[PDB]
Amino acid sequence: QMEEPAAHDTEATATDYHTTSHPGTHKVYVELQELVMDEKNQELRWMEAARWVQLEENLGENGAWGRPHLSHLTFWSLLELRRVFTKGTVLLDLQETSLAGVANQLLDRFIFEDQIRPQDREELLRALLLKHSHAGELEALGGVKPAVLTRSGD
Amino acid sequence: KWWSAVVEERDAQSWTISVTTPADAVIGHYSLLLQVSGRKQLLLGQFTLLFNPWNREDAVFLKNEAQRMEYLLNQNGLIYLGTADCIQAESWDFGQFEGDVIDLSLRLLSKDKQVEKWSQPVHVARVLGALLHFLKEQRVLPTPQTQATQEGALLNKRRGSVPILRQWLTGRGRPVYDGQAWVLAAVACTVLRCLGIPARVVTTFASAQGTGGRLLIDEYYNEEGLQNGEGQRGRIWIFQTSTECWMTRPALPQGYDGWQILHPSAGSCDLVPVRAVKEGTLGLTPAVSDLFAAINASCVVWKCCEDGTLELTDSNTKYVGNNISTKGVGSDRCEDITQNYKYPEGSLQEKEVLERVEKEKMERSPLYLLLKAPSSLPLRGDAQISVTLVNHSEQEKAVQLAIGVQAVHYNGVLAAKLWRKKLHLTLSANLEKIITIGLFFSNFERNPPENTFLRLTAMATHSESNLSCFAQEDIAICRPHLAIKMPEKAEQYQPLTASVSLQNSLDAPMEDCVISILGRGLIHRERSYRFRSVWPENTMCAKFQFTPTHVGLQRLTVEVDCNMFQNLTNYKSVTVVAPEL
Amino acid sequence: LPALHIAARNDDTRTAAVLLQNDPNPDVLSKTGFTPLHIAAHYENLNVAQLLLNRGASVNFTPQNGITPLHIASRRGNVIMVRLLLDRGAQIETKTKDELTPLHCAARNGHVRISEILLDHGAPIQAKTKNGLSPIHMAAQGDHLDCVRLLLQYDAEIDDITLDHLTPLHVAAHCGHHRVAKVLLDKGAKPNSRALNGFTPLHIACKKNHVRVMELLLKTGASIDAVTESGLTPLHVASFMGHLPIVKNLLQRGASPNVSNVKVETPLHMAARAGHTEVAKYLLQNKAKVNAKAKDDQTPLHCAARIGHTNMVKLLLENNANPNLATTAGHTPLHIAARE
Numbered sequence A: 001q002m003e004e005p006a007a008h009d010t011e012a013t014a015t016d017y018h019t020t021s022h023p024g025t026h027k028v029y030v031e032l033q034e035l036v037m038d039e040k041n042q043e044l045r046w047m048e049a050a051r052w053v054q055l056e057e058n059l060g061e062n063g064a065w066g067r068p069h070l071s072h073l074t075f076w077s078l079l080e081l082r083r084v085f086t087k088g089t090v091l092l093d094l095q096e097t098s099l100a101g102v103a104n105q106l107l108d109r110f111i112f113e114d115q116i117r118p119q120d121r122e123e124l125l126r127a128l129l130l131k132h133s134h135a136g137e138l139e140a141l142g143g144v145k146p147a148v149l150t151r152s153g154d
Numbered sequence B: 001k002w003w004s005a006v007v008e009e010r011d012a013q014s015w016t017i018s019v020t021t022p023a024d025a026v027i028g029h030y031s032l033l034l035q036v037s038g039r040k041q042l043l044l045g046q047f048t049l050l051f052n053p054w055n056r057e058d059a060v061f062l063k064n065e066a067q068r069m070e071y072l073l074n075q076n077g078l079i080y081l082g083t084a085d086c087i088q089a090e091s092w093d094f095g096q097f098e099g100d101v102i103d104l105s106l107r108l109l110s111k112d113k114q115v116e117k118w119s120q121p122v123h124v125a126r127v128l129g130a131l132l133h134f135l136k137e138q139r140v141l142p143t144p145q146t147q148a149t150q151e152g153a154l155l156n157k158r159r160g161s162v163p164i165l166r167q168w169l170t171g172r173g174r175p176v177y178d179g180q181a182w183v184l185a186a187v188a189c190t191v192l193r194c195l196g197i198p199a200r201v202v203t204t205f206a207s208a209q210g211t212g213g214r215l216l217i218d219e220y221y222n223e224e225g226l227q228n229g230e231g232q233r234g235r236i237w238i239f240q241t242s243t244e245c246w247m248t249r250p251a252l253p254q255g256y257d258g259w260q261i262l263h264p265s266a267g268s269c270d271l272v273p274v275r276a277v278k279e280g281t282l283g284l285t286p287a288v289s290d291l292f293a294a295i296n297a298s299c300v301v302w303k304c305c306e307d308g309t310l311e312l313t314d315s316n317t318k319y320v321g322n323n324i325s326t327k328g329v330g331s332d333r334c335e336d337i338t339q340n341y342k343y344p345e346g347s348l349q350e351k352e353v354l355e356r357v358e359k360e361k362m363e364r365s366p367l368y369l370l371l372k373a374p375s376s377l378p379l380r381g382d383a384q385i386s387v388t389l390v391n392h393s394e395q396e397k398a399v400q401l402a403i404g405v406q407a408v409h410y411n412g413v414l415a416a417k418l419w420r421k422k423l424h425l426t427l428s429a430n431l432e433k434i435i436t437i438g439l440f441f442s443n444f445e446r447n448p449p450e451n452t453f454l455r456l457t458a459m460a461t462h463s464e465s466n467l468s469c470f471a472q473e474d475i476a477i478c479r480p481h482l483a484i485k486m487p488e489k490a491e492q493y494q495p496l497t498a499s500v501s502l503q504n505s506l507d508a509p510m511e512d513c514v515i516s517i518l519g520r521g522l523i524h525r526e527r528s529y530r531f532r533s534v535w536p537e538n539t540m541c542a543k544f545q546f547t548p549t550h551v552g553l554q555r556l557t558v559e560v561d562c563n564m565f566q567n568l569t570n571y572k573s574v575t576v577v578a579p580e581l
Numbered sequence C: 001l002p003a004l005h006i007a008a009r010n011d012d013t014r015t016a017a018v019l020l021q022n023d024p025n026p027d028v029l030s031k032t033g034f035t036p037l038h039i040a041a042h043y044e045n046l047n048v049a050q051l052l053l054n055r056g057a058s059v060n061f062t063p064q065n066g067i068t069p070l071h072i073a074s075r076r077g078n079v080i081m082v083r084l085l086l087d088r089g090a091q092i093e094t095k096t097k098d099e100l101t102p103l104h105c106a107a108r109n110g111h112v113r114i115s116e117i118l119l120d121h122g123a124p125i126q127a128k129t130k131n132g133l134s135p136i137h138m139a140a141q142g143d144h145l146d147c148v149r150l151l152l153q154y155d156a157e158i159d160d161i162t163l164d165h166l167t168p169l170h171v172a173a174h175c176g177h178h179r180v181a182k183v184l185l186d187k188g189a190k191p192n193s194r195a196l197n198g199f200t201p202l203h204i205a206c207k208k209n210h211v212r213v214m215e216l217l218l219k220t221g222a223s224i225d226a227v228t229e230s231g232l233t234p235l236h237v238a239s240f241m242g243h244l245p246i247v248k249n250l251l252q253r254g255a256s257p258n259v260s261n262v263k264v265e266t267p268l269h270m271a272a273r274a275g276h277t278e279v280a281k282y283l284l285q286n287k288a289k290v291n292a293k294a295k296d297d298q299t300p301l302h303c304a305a306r307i308g309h310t311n312m313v314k315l316l317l318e319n320n321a322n323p324n325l326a327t328t329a330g331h332t333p334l335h336i337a338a339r340e
Helices: A011-017 A075-086 A099-112 A118-127 A135-141 B065-073 B101-109 B121-139 B162-169 B183-195 B274-279 B288-293 B348-363 C004-009 C013-022 C036-042 C047-053 C069-076 C079-087 C102-109 C112-120 C135-141 C145-154 C168-175 C178-187 C201-207 C212-220 C234-241 C244-252 C267-271 C277-285 C300-305 C310-318 C333-339
Strands: A031-038 A044-051 B004-011 B014-020 B028-034 B042-049 B076-082 B087-093 B199-207 B216-221 B237-247 B258-264 B269-273 B298-303 B322-327 B334-336 B367-372 B376-378 B382-391 B397-408 B414-427 B433-440 B453-462 B468-478 B482-485 B489-491 B496-503 B514-519 B539-546 B552-561 B568-577
Touching: A099 A118, B028 B101, B065 B199, B065 C079, B076 B199, B076 B322, B087 B568, B101 B121, B101 B162, B101 B183, B121 B162, B121 B183, B121 B237, B121 B258, B121 B269, B162 B183, B183 B199, B183 B237, B258 B274, B269 B274, B274 B288, B298 B468, B334 C145, B367 B453, B367 B468, B376 B382, B382 B397, B382 B414, B382 B453, B414 B433, B482 B552, B482 B568, B496 B552, C004 C013, C004 C036, C013 C047, C036 C047, C036 C069, C047 C079, C069 C079, C069 C102, C079 C112, C102 C112, C102 C135, C112 C145, C135 C145, C135 C168, C145 C178, C168 C178, C168 C201, C168 C212, C178 C212, C201 C212, C201 C234, C201 C244, C212 C244, C234 C244, C234 C267, C234 C277, C244 C277, C267 C277, C267 C300, C277 C310, C300 C310, C300 C333
Parallel strands: B216 B298, B376 B468, B489 B568
Antiparallel strands: A031 A044, B004 B014, B028 B042, B076 B087, B199 B237, B199 B322, B237 B258, B258 B269, B322 B334, B367 B382, B382 B433, B397 B414, B397 B453, B453 B468, B482 B496, B496 B539, B514 B552, B552 B568
C-alpha cells in the first residue's frame, strides 16, 4: 500500500508572509445565513436571518425586517466560540475571486490539519455550492423549514 | 501625442472620458484633479504609470511578444548553479506582482531628489543599481564560523525575493549570510520586472571577480599542493550572476541599442551594451575595460616553498568565463548566449581585437602530466581518476608527486582541507605512464560543508630540476534523483494526486524525514509532512492530493530535509485548463 | 496600395478596413512582390493579420522566390503567428528557390520552440536542401546547443553526410564550437569519419586553429597517426598553416616528426616551403633528423632557397645541413639560390 503520512507544522517561514501593507479603515456590514429547506421540494439552501448595519435587525418568516435593537448573545454560544476558536483554523490574505477556490483551500487545510474525514469532503462541497437566494425570492418559495445534511444526502 | 482627454459617450447622468498619455513621462503615484472655472479643484483619484514594451514609439521597446512574457510577465524562473560540466537549475519565485512591492520600489526611488531625470530609464536603472549594491553591502551578515548542522537546514533555505527585500528594508526576518551573496542580481532583476524594464538573469561560469585593470592573475600554492594562506585581491570565482536589461541608448553613439549588463562599482553604477563589451572599445565607458578584462585574462600560478622564494610552474592553460547561460523562453531549459559575448577562439577577429586592446594597454619541460577526472562524484560514494606522465629525455628521472583535495566556496574562499597524498616515481626510457587512483569519501579527513566544491590539485616536482608540473580540477557533489509522477493537463477545480519517489542511494539509513510542498495558485502557502526511517536498500514513494485553482501554466516545488542533507529541492510544471461549460 | 503595406506595418485597422470594404483585392504585390501578409507576419501586427485572414488570404501564396510567409515567420521567430497560420491551414512541406523548409531557417536562426512545435505538427526530420544539408548541420553552425539537444532527443541519425560527406562534427570543427562537439561526442559519434578528401576532424582543427576541439578530440582517443588521401598527417597540416600552440600541444601529447608522405617529406621540408619560423624551431628542438631527403631528395635547404628568407637558413645551418649535398638532378643550394 501507499502509506498516507502525517502532517507537521513548523512556522519558521511564517515570517515569510507578513506584508507591510497598512490596509486602511472600513465599515462593515454583517449578514448571517444558515442551511434550511423549502416546503414544496426537499432541497436545502442558505437563508439569511439578520443584518448588522448598526444594530441587529432580524428577518421574520413573513419576509419583513423588524426594528433595530441592542445585541444580546447567549452564554453557551460564547463558550463554544472560545473552545472552537482556540483550536480553530485561520486562512489570511487569500488570493481568490470565486467562492469555489476558497472552499477548496478550506477543505485542503481541513484535511491537512485532520479537521474532517476525507470521505465527507464531497457532501459538504456539494452543500457549499448551492444557490444563494435573497429577500425578494422568499414569497416566491412559499415557506421554508430548517434542514440538516446527511451522509446519504437525503 | 501630448496629454489629451476626450469625452466620447454621454449619458444624462454620466460621461465616459478617455484619458491619453505621453510616451515620455515620469512614473510614480499620480493624482487627478478637476478644476471648473467656478469651483475649487476636486480630487478624483490616484493611479500609477509604468513602462510598456507594447508601444512602438517609446524608447524602451521590444518587438517580440514572447520575450516580453518571459522577461517581464513571468514569475516562475530558474537559476543555474554547479559547474559548467553539470549544471543544476533551482526553481525561484520572484513574486514581482504582489501588492506592496511597487510602493516599496518607489520608496527606494524617492531618495534621489532629482525628479525630472526620473523620466528616463538610464538614470533610474543606474541609481537603483547603486542603492541596491549599497543595501546589500549594508544588510548582509557574515556566515557563522561555528558548525551548526542541526540549524543548517534553516541557514541556507531560500523562499524567494520579497522576504529578502522586506528584511533588507526593515530587518525583521532572517538575514542572508555570505554563503549566498549572489542573490543580489536576482533581487535587482525583480525590481526592474516590477517597474516595467525588461530584464533577465545570466550566469557566468569561471569568472575572475576581484581587482581589474590588469590581465594577469597570481596564485600561491603550497609545497604539498594546497594554497598557503587564504584569499586574494583578484581570484577566479567558480560562477557569477549578472543582470541584463533591454533598452536603447540615445546618449551613446548610434549602433548600440539592445541588451545591457548592469554593473555596480565600489557609489556609482552603470550599464553597458553587450556589443560594446564584445568589440572592446575601452574609452566608451570607464567600466567596460575591467568587465571585458574580467572575461578574457590569463592567470599564472606560483609555487611557495619552505625558504619563502616563489617559483613559476608549468601548467596546462585553463579557461575563464565560459558557458554563460540563462533560462530559455517558453520552456524550462537552458540557453547559452555566449556567441553574443565572445568571438570564436582562434579567429582572425579575436586576434585582431586582442592586439588592439594590448596596444591600448601598452600605453597604460622534459616531463609533463595530464589529468582525467569525472565531472560528477556521488555523495557518500567514490570515483576513479587518472594522471598520465610523459617525459622527453633519454635518461631516467626521479619525480615526487603530490595530490591535494580541499573544499572551496563559490567566491574563491577556501572552505576545508580534505585529503593529501605524496609518493615517489621513476620515469624511464621516454615512455608514457598512466596512474589510476580511486577517491573514496571514507578516506577523507572531514565532512564537507553545506555548499562547497572540491578542488583537486596535482604537483609533480622533478628531483633534479626545480621546474615542476601542475594541474587542477574542480568537482561538484551530486544528490540522488527525485521522481515526480503527475499527468500533463488538468481541469480547474478538480482533484489531482501527485507522486514523489526517492531511492536511498546512500550507505546510511535516513532519519527525521521532513518534506514540504508548495506552489503558487495550487496551495495557499506551504505544507509539510514527516516520515519514518528509510534504510539504504529500500526507497520511499508518497502521494499528495490538491486542486488547481488559477488557469494557465503553473509549477509546484517539493523540498526534502533529513539528517544527511538539507534543502534537496525538485519541481514540476503543469498546464491547467478551464472547466467545460 | 503602396500604403496598404504601411498600414500593415503600423497595424492601422480602420484604414485597411475601409480599403477592403471598398476594394475586393485581398492580395496585391509590391515592387519586390511581397504581400501585406509578409510584413504582417514580420512585425507581428495581428489585428490586421486576422482581418486579412478572415477573407481570401491564401496561406500557400508563393512568389517567384518561393519564400512562404511561414518561412519569414520562422526566420524572425514569432510564435503566435506560426500558431495562427497553422490553425488557419498551412502546407508544411514546401520549398523555396533554394528548397529551404521553414525548419531549415528555424535551425539556422536558433529558435528552438518553433522547431519543437513544427516537429510536433508532423514536419519530417530528414530533409535535403539544394546542397543536401540537414537542419542539424545549420544548427551546429550557429552554435545553438540546446536546439541540437532537442533534435537529438526527438530523432536524429548522427553520422549523416551530404553531397560533400560532412558529419555535423565536421562542420562543428569547421565553425569552432566545442560545446556541440561535447554533446555530439557523449551522445554518439565516430572520430574515424572522413570526408571525400579524406580529412580527419583533427585535420580541420589543425586548419582552423581551434584548440578546445583538438583537446577534446584527443581526450576522446582520436588517433595521432592518420593518413589523408593525399598522404599527409595532422601535424603536417598544423605545420603548413603556421599555428604554434597547436603544434606545441600535439607534439607534447605524442607525435613523430620522422614521418613520410606519399612523397617522402618531413614537416620540416613541407614547412620550409612557407617558412614558418617558430614551428620549425620547435620541431628542431625535439628529435628530428635535419639531414633528410625529399621525394626528389631535396634537402630542406633546397626548399628554403626558393623563399629567399634569411634566418631560416641560419637556423638550418645551426644544425649544419651541408651545402655539399645536392639533388638527383645535380642542382645545389647555390644553384637554386642563383636561380631565384
